[PDB]
Amino acid sequence: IIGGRESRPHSRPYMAYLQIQSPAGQSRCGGFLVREDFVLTAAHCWGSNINVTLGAHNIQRRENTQQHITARRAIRHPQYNQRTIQNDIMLLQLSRRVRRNRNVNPVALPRAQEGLRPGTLCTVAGWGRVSMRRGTDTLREVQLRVQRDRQCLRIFGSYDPRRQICVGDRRERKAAFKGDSGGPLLCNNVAHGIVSYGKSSGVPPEVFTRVSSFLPWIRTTMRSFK
Ligand SMILES: CC(=O)NCCc1c([C@@H](C2=C(O)[C@@](C)(c3ccccc3)OC2=O)c2ccccc2)[nH]c2cc(F)ccc12
Ligand SMILES: [Zn+2]
Ligand SMILES: [Zn+2]
């Protein structure tokens, strides 16, 4: 998170810290608990192994609030496209249910057909970088404004307003960045978006997955692999 602040510890108890292991080494993503057995995140965060840490604030320290659960399945949308980054959405079926408590509990999703309009102020949180090339170990958050479609259509290779949200005012140095992918865009305490990607410079606007568009996929998947 660029241009944000440290979150109050455990104030976002749905936040999931993901460590993604692959032949390229280790990478970081966020995610969010949507039921006691499922974390929602971005498909590009897939790797050979995905370890989930729930209940965290400082991910460089053991904390008694933490729960460590490996993903039993990492279920990517069937139309995820690595080149265009379309359909950048994935569900992690946890290998066991969380122990629900005030530090670990799920966040609401939009209702069916519930939209999200340009101009809405939302919050994004994560453990990603705080500048183009510096990181952090504690959870941070920043408020960003939903942009009109045109802002992202003009500057990205592939953008679809039906499935994506365009987020962040270009004049403000405030953005999700590397390490934040998969985390939620919270608008009035509902997770309407998933951090996907932006420019390598960190200059907004950036692209989020529009959760409301994928509710059928989310619901069916959660039922099948409950
Ligand atoms: C290819 C691309 O569009 N890069 C943009 C830089 C960027 C990324 C990139 C990215 C990761 O997410 C990460 C940490 C990674 C994690 C897990 C597995 C692989 C890689 O390392 C990366 O470099 C990225 C990579 C692939 C697909 C989408 C995004 N995440 C962001 C999020 C933001 F909020 C703003 C800008 C970006
Ligand atoms: Zn704590
Ligand atoms: Zn740990």
Swiss-Prot record:
Query: Which UniProt keywords are given for this protein, alphabetically ordered?
Result: Antibiotic, Antimicrobial, Cell membrane, Chemotaxis, Cytoplasm, Disulfide bond, Glycoprotein, Hydrolase, Lysosome, Membrane, Nucleus, Protease, Secreted, Serine protease, Signal, Zymogen
| Assembly and binders | (Microbial infection) Interacts with CASP4; the interaction is promoted by the Td92 surface protein of the periodontal pathogen T.denticola and leads to CASP4 activation. (Microbial infection) Interacts with M.tuberculosis protein Rv3364c.
Q: How is its activity regulated?
A: Inhibited by soybean trypsin inhibitor, benzamidine, the synthetic peptide R13K, Z-Gly-Leu-Phe-CH2Cl, phenylmethylsulfonyl fluoride, 3,4-dichloroisocoumarin, DFP, SBTI and alpha-1-antitrypsin. Inhibited by LPS from P.aeruginosa but not by LPS from S.minnesota. Not inhibited by elastinal, CMK, TLCK, ETDA or leupeptin.
Give the top-level enzyme category. hydrolase
According to UniProt, the reaction catalysed is: Specificity similar to chymotrypsin C
> Main role?
Serine protease with trypsin- and chymotrypsin-like specificity. Also displays antibacterial activity against Gram-negative and Gram-positive bacteria independent of its protease activity. Prefers Phe and Tyr residues in the P1 position of substrates but also cleaves efficiently after Trp and Leu. Shows a preference for negatively charged amino acids in the P2' position and for aliphatic amino acids both upstream and downstream of the cleavage site. Required for recruitment and activation of platelets which is mediated by the F2RL3/PAR4 platelet receptor.
Q: Does the keyword Signal apply?
A: yes
Task: Quote the EC number.
Answer: 3.4.21.20
User: Locate the Peptidase S1 domain: which residues?
Assistant: 1-223
* Pfam annotation, one family: Trypsin
**Quick one: where's region Important for antimicrobial activity?**
1-5, 77-91
Q: Report the InterPro entries cross-referenced here.
A: Peptidase_S1_PA (IPR009003), Peptidase_S1_PA_chymotrypsin (IPR043504), Peptidase_S1A (IPR001314), Trypsin_dom (IPR001254), TRYPSIN_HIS (IPR018114), TRYPSIN_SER (IPR033116)
Q: How is it modified after translation?
A: Two C-terminal truncation variants have been identified, one which ends at Arg-223 and one which ends at Ser-224.
Q: Belongs to which family?
A: Belongs to the peptidase S1 family.
Q: Which cysteines are joined by disulfide bonds?
A: C29-C45, C122-C187, C152-C166
Q: Name one GO cellular component term.
A: extracellular region
Membrane topology term reads: Peripheral membrane protein
A GO BP term, please? neutrophil activation
Tissue specificity, per the record, is:
Expressed in neutrophils (at protein level). Expressed in B cells.
Tell me the domain of life.
Answer: Eukaryota
- Catalytic residues, per the record, are H44, D88, S181
Q: Where does the record say this protein resides?
A: Cell membrane; Cytoplasmic granule; Secreted; Cytoplasm, Cytosol
Q: Which residues are glycosylated?
A: N51
What does the entry say induces or represses the expression of this protein?
A: Induced by the Td92 surface protein of the periodontal pathogen T.denticola. Down-regulated in monocytes following M.tuberculosis infection and exposure to bacterial lipopolysaccharide which coincides with increased M.tuberculosis replication and intracellular survival.
Q: Which gene encodes it?
A: CTSG
The protein here is known as Cathepsin G
